[PDB]
Each structure stands twice: as C-alpha cells, then as structure tokens.
Amino acid sequence: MTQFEGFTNLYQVSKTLRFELIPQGKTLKHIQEQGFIEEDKARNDHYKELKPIIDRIYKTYADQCLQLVQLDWENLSAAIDSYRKEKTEETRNALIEEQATYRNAIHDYFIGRTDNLTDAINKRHAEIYKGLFKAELFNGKVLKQLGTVTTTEHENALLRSFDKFTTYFSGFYENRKNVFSAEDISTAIPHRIVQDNFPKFKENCHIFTRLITAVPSLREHFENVKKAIGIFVSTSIEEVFSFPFYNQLLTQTQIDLYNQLLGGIIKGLNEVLNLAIQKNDETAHIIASLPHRFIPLFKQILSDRVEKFKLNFQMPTLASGWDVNKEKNNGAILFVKNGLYYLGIMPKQKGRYKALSFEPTEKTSEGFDKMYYDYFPDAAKMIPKCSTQLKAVTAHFQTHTTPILLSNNFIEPLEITKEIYDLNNPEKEPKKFQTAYAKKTGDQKGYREALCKWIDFTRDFLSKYTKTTSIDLSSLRPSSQYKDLGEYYAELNPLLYHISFQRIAEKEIMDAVETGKLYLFQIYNKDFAKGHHGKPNLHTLYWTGLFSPENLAKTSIKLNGQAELFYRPRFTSDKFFFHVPITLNYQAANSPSKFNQRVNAYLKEHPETPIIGIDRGERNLIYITVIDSTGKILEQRSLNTIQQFDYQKKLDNREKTIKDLKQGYLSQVIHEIVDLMIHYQAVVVLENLNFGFKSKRTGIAEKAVYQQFEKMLIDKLNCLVLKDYPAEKVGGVLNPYQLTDQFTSFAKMGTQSGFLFYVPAPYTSKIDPLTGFVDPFVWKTIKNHESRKHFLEGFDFLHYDVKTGDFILHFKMNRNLSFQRGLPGFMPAWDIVFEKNETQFDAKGTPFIAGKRIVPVIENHRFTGRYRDLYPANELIALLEEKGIVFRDGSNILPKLLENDDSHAIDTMVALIRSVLQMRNSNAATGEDYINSPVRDLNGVCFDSRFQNPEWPMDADANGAYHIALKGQLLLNHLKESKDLKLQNGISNQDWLAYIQELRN
RNA sequence: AAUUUCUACUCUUGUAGAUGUGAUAAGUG
DNA sequence: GTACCGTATCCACTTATCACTAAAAGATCGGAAG
DNA sequence: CTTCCGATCTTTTAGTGATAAGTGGATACGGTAC
C-alpha cells in the first residue's frame, strides 16, 4: 500500500518568478547613451493603439464571413432534445460529436472549403484565412484583397512602423486563433454559435410555440410589437422564432435587434408580457402557470455593443529561449558568481549583429560561470518538425513512392519510407498510432503495429539527429512494451533537457561590459541583500533549488523559456523587472490522471486519518477543529491571532483598504492550515460556498473573499514546499507535496479535490454536538393568534419535575406539520427539557447561571439591537403563577394554560418557546458566545458549552467547525462503504441529520 | 517602516508567511 | 398588527483559453559574372 | 550597368492523452399601510 509521502511527483505544475534587475557598471549608462527605452515605450504605445485597428479587421472579416451561413439546425435540435430527455452517456457522446461536426462545418465556412459555397469564393476565403495569421497583415495582401476597410495615412504609417517585427504580435496572433478555432473552447466563435447561443434560441422558440398553443391572442399582439419597434419587418413573428431564422442572427447587429425587440427601448415584448400577467385575469393565470419570459441572446465575440513597458531592445524573440543554438538570436544568458546571479543581454550591433561567443576557461580561474542550456523541445511538436512535414519529403512523396534519405543537419543519413508518412498523415483526423483510431475503430493489432513502427522510427531519429545523438537513450523501455505513446512522450521529454556550467574569465566579461557590447544585470530581491539574516522566501527557494547540483544531476525543477523584461518609470526611481517561468515536478506527467481515485484508495487503505474542519466564526475570524476517525475531537483553535498578532483587533478598530488586509490575513492563516495538514497527515474540509449564503456577522462575510481563499488554498496545496525541510526530502524544494487536483472552475470541480473535501453549509452551527437536535419550526409563519393556538395544540404534554425543579416537554414528528420545517429527524419523539436556572461552575470554577438566554428587543415591530438577557424558567413560572396554576402535582400544564385562551398568555408563551429553542446565544457587548441545548442526551445531561469541557466545543464557532468535520466524516464513511472509490457529490440535510442522530443517539 | 509584489511588524540597513506572469475574450452583480 | 413589496451595488469581479520554442523556411542584402 | 549567387535575419511551425459528465437552488431591511 501507499504512504502519505507517496503523494509527490504526480504531475507537472507551471509557476513563474519575478525579480528586480540591478544594472552592473556602465550598462545603464550605455542604455542611457543608446536610448532604447524610449523606442521600446513608443513601440508598446503603437502596439496598444494598433490593437483596436487589427481587431476591426478581424471583426470585418468575421461578419463578412458569417453573413453567408446556409446550414440547417433541426438535427442538432433533435440531438439536444434526446439528451435532455434521456441524459444517457451515449446520447451525450452523440450530442458532443454532432456539435463538433457543426463546429467544423462552420469552420469550413470560415476557412473556405465548404461544399455549399463556390470554389472560387472558397479559395478566396482560404487565402484570407491563411493570410490572417501571418506577417502579411502589415501593409500586405490582406488589406488589398478585403477592400471593405478604409485606412487613413496615419494608420498606414502606424502599421508600417512594425516592419520586420511582427513576432512582437505573435502571441496575440495565436490568441486570435482561439477566436477562430473550432475545438470546443469558450472563446471560439463556433462554440458560441453551436453550443452557447443556439440553446437559448431553441428554448425561446419552444416556449413561444407552447404559449401560442396555450393562447393565440397575444400573437397578433406580438406582431404590433414588431410594428412598434419596426424590426424584422420583412418576416413574420412565428417565422422569427423558427429554425430557418437561426440562419440569420449571426452578426452582432442582428443579435442586438433580437435582444432589443424583447427588451424594448418604447414598448418591448417582455413588458407586454408583464402587463398581460398583471391583468390577473384567466389568461394571465394560464400564462403565469407556464414559462412566460424569453431569455436574451449573448453578444457576439470581439464586437462592439504603476504602469510598465515591455522591453525588446529592438530585437524580436528576446529571451524566448535559453538554448545555446538560439543564444545567438535570443541573446539572454545567465551567470552564477559566488552565490549571486546575473543576466546578460547582448544587443544588436551597428547595422548587422555581431556575436560574442565566450570561450570556456578553467574552473579554478576567477570569473563567472555561464550556464549552458541543451533543450530539444517537446517531442510532439519537434519530431514532425523534422523528418516528415519537411517540404522536401512531402513534395518527393507526392511525386514518388521511393523512400527518401535525408542528411542535412544529421550525423548520419536517415531513411523514411512511405509507410511512416502514411502513419503520420493518413488523410484522416485519427492517426494510426493515435488513440482516437483505437477508440473509433477498435483495431488494436494495427494500433500496436503502427505504434511499434512509429516508436522505432523516432528512436532511429533520436539516435541520428545531431542535437540528440549525444544524448543517451538507454533508459527507455523496449519498443513493443509501451501501451500508449502519450506515456512514452512523457517519459522521453525529460531526457532531452540538460544544464551545464562553465567558468568564464572575469576580464573578458567586464571588457564586454566596458565597451557596451554586453549588457549585464544582477537578478535581485530582498533575500540577496548583504544584510539578509533570516529564512528566505519561497521563490528564492525555487531559484536556489533550480541551480542546485543534484538538481543538475536529475532535473526535478525545469527552467522554462519565454522570459519577459519590463521597465517601470521602491517607486522613487525607475526599475527593471525580470519575469521568468519555471516548471516543477518536470519528471512527472503533464496532466493529472485519476487523482481523486488515488486519494480515495489511500483513504480506504488508511482509515485512521484525522479530519480538520474549517469554519467561519462570529468572534474568531476562522476556527479550526481536528477530530479522529471515531469523531472524538483532538484540537480546537481560533486563528484570530497568527504569529502573536491578533487580527480581529485590527479589523474592528480600522473599520470605523479592508480587502488587502483580508488578503493578508488569509495568506497568514494558509501557513497554519498547511502546517496542521502536514502534521496530522489528514484530510481537510471546507464549506461548499455555492450551496449557501449565511454569516452576515462573521468578519469574513462576503462570498468572494472566502471563495478566493479556497482558490489560494487549492493553489498552495497543488504543489507544496516547506522552508525548514531539506531539499531532497519529500516535501522539500525538488520533491514537493501534491495533494489537490488542479483548479479548473468552481462549478466543474465537484466536491472532492484530492485531500480537500466540501460540505453543504447549513445545519452545522446551531445543532447539538451530543444529540444532534435542531429547532424544527420556521418562525415567519407564526404571526396570527389562532395560528399560535394551533402551535400550542401541536405539542404533546408539559409537566413540572418535582425532583430537580425543571420542566419536561414532549413532542413527536408526526404532529404540528403546519409549522414544522420539511426535514424530519431520525427518531420520531423529541424530549425538550426546560432546565431550571441554577448557578454552576465550569472546569476552572468560573461562576455561571445555567439555562440563561438572550433575545433581541423589538420596537415598532422592528429590531433595534439592544440584545437583552432573560431567564426562561423564571418567566415561565412568572406567567404560570400570573393566573395561579398548581404545578407541584406534576400534571399536564398544557391544557390548563390552553383552556383560558388568553391571547397575551399565548404570545408570551410562544416567546418563551422561542427563547428556549434559540440554539446559540451570543452578545458582543458583554462578550458571551455559547451553546445551550434544552434536550438531555442518552447519559441524561443537557449540553451546555459554558462548562468549558475539552471533550466538546468551547464555542458555537467550534461547534460549527466540529459539525463540518462530522460531515466530512460522513463523506468518508460513505467512501468506505462504497466500492467505486467515488462519492455522492453532495449530501442532503435529511440524510446528514439522520446520520448524526443515529450515530450520536 | 525598509519588500519582485502583497499583508503584518521593526531584535536585526531588516523579520514571518503568501506570491503564474503576459495577452485576449465573454458573463455577472 | 397583518400582508406585502422593493431596494442598496453604477467599476469591479469572476470565468474561460493559450505561450512558456528550436529550427525550418522564407525574406533581404551585398558581392561577383556577362 | 544588370543579374544571379550565397550569408544573415525574421517568421512560423510542428501537435500527444485522457475523463471528468451532466450537477440545485436562493433572498432581505424596512417601511409603510389598510
């Protein structure tokens, strides 16, 4: 079985680091001599003022292209109706596939190969699609072929100013591909049309024909609304709410008119429906019993309805890669000198660029240590960059069937037959070695043969290519044993990455600095100062562990390319910022796989793991409870004071910039929760925020702040390092703890994310930690006098107890259903004890009155806040002896107080009832916060948190945290009884109540 | 109150935690 | 005192996507042959 | 003088896997009103 230390190196995680750059020597002076910063600022300004223009080009082509759509939609309507009726995974896959083919069909409309258009117009659209993601956007063929857009002379000079520099737009270029892609991404126009916008129109047409079949008299009414605004006058109303009209409403203008016809501007259709409903006649009732509103349609994509400068040093792809081959054109290098780190940027020389090419020197010689970065990039995107997909081999193979020998950039000629090009290009979307072919066709032996041939071919290429022939590949498994090539690529990719270090003479370096031929900066933060004394930052730990020698021996933290430079005009003077991304757990796979299943397997193998419940308290900001497998608690904690600094005492006296203090407080408490997590080897539970909205008195009140606190808790638990831990130890810098799955979205992540669970919010604070009893009555229904008589007659019997002086009330769940909430308990009979108010002492001998309650005062039928204390037994005996009832007999007092039917007596009696079943009682003026249950348990004692017993929660905050931990225990027990290593993805209040009452009574 | 950046302090010209950046688009209150 | 109806959120905040790239391929310029 | 050749710098370009899967709703001070 696995251990808790086994949850490391599961999947990669990409992070980034930020540093300041301190100029070295005359370097800044040379920059101040050369004036690159003003030109880079002008380049950035021109880019940001040219972005709307190129955006306008994109909008014009998008509208001009999608105005010609001639596709029908009834088949995908039938598919989505079938999935709505059935929710079958076969119907789910069919719906996904049919949406995908519709997206590809309108993509062929976009890229000009659809059969519905003329092949000349198709070729024109194909040329435009090829042009729109290339350098010919800048004073090239695109603007001439699409003459619909006029450009002023200033705007042509602005477009010309980026000559030979389109790579600066290149990432944005790829971003526009995300607009025009068809791979189900939410930014894509095909996903907006096929998957997002269409179901709203389908629902609108369905509810319209339902309304028409219900009553047709509004139909002509709709017609004059269509004549009120004068929109779509060439067509009728029922033609608009039909499938062939969805061949219109693709441009943003048509969507705008369709939305404004419903919303008005001047009467609209929705307000016409509102006046029809407000008539409250029979037709209003039959349309109020049906969905009587139309949802609007979403707006189309990219259509209208201290700052810093990016630095490039007039040299594109600056720090795009660290490789020595691309060191010539990227110009970014690193040096290490007695613990300090330096960044070298060689700018382009006068006219042409001249390389520097420092020679190696002896290690014993004084000077810097230049790093050498050998990195063949990802095999998927690199192996077909050479061999097949070379223009020469594709042309030759289009002409001949003979295998071709290539020798350029090879240490030995490599042969490629037609078979390998057929596996990599089978003219179909699923390639023969690809898993989609095995999924669709099921030919597993042909899949195995194609995989073996491809694996042998890429092994031969890795042996023959000049960048990779030096690298040893003996660690690879034999070819026929790989079950899929994704695992092979994840295995092969770490073997193609190496970092060396070679000493460079100091004199050459600072001579290059002295002439200005090499620019040198020092990577710097607080921790690299000479007065550094304490524990360093986490990013400093990653940066140090990146260049540690045993990390160079085996790379667990990988240095990425794509580094950026910024200039900020701390803020006393201008500063240079350097941003660099890194990848941690590089030896592991790129994506998590069955992470929750692995966590449940460990949890089933380790039933003794504790549970930490997290709760938002009223007095304490965040409360912590740690309990065992049997539900007995181990630790209660209030996190108001973190590192001997109270935080409530800052919030209260500063509330009379809150958000940044809240962020800082959550950042401090995240270290505490992760310390308890790693100390107890346990699981943690948080409340599910989307299933409740409470805590108007808790300092952490907003949904947003707790929601993003869970965001950073998930991010922190995704990869976890500790400053005290050694680097090679599990939990260290190069072996971080991975315990939670990657965040995708709060709606799609479910309830369990690794070792972190989620629990529905209510019925956690105001509930007995000994009996699980809760108040069953909604009290907004208790207003009228006969209503409170039915409230009184719903109870069984009440009688004084002579022995201990308390009162005994009985209730059963089969009665008083008119005022009872719809959540019955596990047992059918509850016994309320009205405890006599007597003085007792807690575990430390603090005097306290048992059974005391506090209720708010009411003035002008409204609360005022002066939260006033009362003694429920004293008021009960006061109103009891108000009219003189004998009670020492122990008889049923309820019909004796019921027969007189005094309205004031029933009012104060139900007020006393509200007093006694008020679960928690907390007043901030005197600081009381306590839980007092008017129900005795099986042992025979009613719970009261004023006793300060360490077996039970101190406070209602701790009570809620304990009950959240108990809900996590319920989820864990449901996991133990389950066999699929999954969960129910949610628990109801009734099952939770029944569970806690069965296992606690 | 000194920070790649943020929060909280000043035993220490500093300290304790957190810290994926850049770009784009959409939705909501 | 029992229905009951609407107000306070208006610039910010939250969800999706992708790049984390050497090297081929193509444009560009300076020098030599008819 | 005009044209064809190789160095040199900018762009673009290759593409793997593997399931989640369909998941439920929810008002609140407060004030004014018959």
Swiss-Prot record:
Site location (Binds target DNA): 708
Catalytic activity as recorded in UniProt: Endonucleolytic cleavage to 5'-phosphodinucleotide and 5'-phosphooligonucleotide end-products; RNA = a 5'-hydroxy-ribonucleotide + n nucleoside-2',3'-cyclophosphates
Renumbered residue ranges of the record's region RuvC-II: 657-760
Keyword Ribonucleoprotein: no
Effect of residue 176 to A: Decreased guided indel formation
Region of interest called WED-II (OBD-I), as start-end residue ranges on this chain: 306-376
Biotechnology: This class of CRISPR enzymes recognize a 5' T-rich protospacer adjacent motif (PAM, TTTN for this specific enzyme), unlike Cas9 enzymes which recognize 3' G-rich PAMs, thus this enzyme increases the possibilites for genome editing. When appropriately expressed in a human cell line mediates human genome editing via indel formation; its T-rich PAM sequence may make it useful for engineering of AT-rich genomes or of regions such as scaffold-matrix attachment areas. It has also been engineered to recognize altered PAM sequences, which will enlarge its target scope.
Region (PI (LHD)): 377-496
Catalytic residues in the record: 615, 687, 920, 957
Residues annotated as site: Binds crRNA: 18, 192, 579
Membrane-crossing residue ranges in chain numbering: none
Extra information: Part of a type V-A CRISPR-Cas system.
UniProt subunit comment: Monomer.
Domain notes: Has a bilobed structure, with the REC lobe (residues 35-526) connected to the NUC lobe (residues 1-35 and 526-1307) by a discontinuous wedge domain. The crRNA-target DNA heteroduplex is bound in the channel between the 2 lobes. One nuclease site is found in the discontinuous RuvC domain which probably cuts target DNA strand in the crRNA-DNA heteroduplex (residues 884-940, 957-1066 and 1262-1307), the other in the NUC domain and probably cuts the non-target DNA strand outside the heteroduplex (residues 1067-1261). Target DNA binding induces domain movement.
Role description: CRISPR (clustered regularly interspaced short palindromic repeat), is an adaptive immune system that provides protection against mobile genetic elements (viruses, transposable elements and conjugative plasmids). CRISPR clusters contain sequences complementary to antecedent mobile elements and target invading nucleic acids. CRISPR clusters are transcribed and processed into CRISPR RNA (crRNA).
Designated name of the protein: CRISPR-associated endonuclease Cas12a
